[PDB]
């Protein structure tokens, strides 16, 4: 199901692109990634991760029960990630309207307790405000953050 919805998301055009990202972490090779490739990858970076965190990684991709990770499995992970802007932008909402008002980011930023301004926060709304409503929504929060 959610193979055969990702895969019509991205067609040979797209998967090509998506191949090349998929064979750096198929360095040892294969035309799959498993837990220890995986670990290989992320200190080829320079990050130590540890194993048994790497392996749970794939666990929650692994819905179906593979163990692995799969090549269509990289494709429907890749279709399944604006979601955390979203998470972000309804905390700033405290009221859960749609949009964020200047008076509920006003306590945010005092809540703090770092010595801001008003004079400071309100010419900041005013500035990011490109067609000045009043209130932040989920369109200037993509380039807000």
């Known amino acids: ?18 191949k090349a990202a998929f064979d750096m972490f198929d360095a040892d090779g294969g035309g799959d990634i498993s837990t220890k490739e995986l670990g290989t990858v992320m ?9 048994e965190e790497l392996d749970a990684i794939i666990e ?6 593979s ?11 890749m279709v399944r990630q604006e979601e955390e802007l979203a998470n972000c932008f ?3 909402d405290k009221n859960a309207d749609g ?9 945010i930023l005092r809540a703090t307790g770092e010595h801001v301004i008003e ?8 500035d990011s405000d490109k067609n ?4 932040i929504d989920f369109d200037e929060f993509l380039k807000m953050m």
Do not use: C, H, W, Y
Request: hydrophobic share 40%.
């Open 119 to 126: 004079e400071d926060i309100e010419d900041l709304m005013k």
């Open 132 to 135: 000045n409503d009043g209130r």
């Open 60 to 65: 929650e991709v692994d819905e179906d029960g």
């Open 67 to 77: 163990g692995t990770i799969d090549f269509e499995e990289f494709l429907v992970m």
């Open 1 to 18: 199901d959610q193979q055969a919805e990702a895969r019509a998301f991205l067609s040979e055009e797209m998967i090509a692109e998506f």
């Open 90 to 92: 309804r905390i700033f």
């Open 43 to 51: 200190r080829m970076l320079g990050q130590n991760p540890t194993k």
């Open 99 to 107: 949009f964020i008002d200047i008076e509920e980011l006003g306590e």
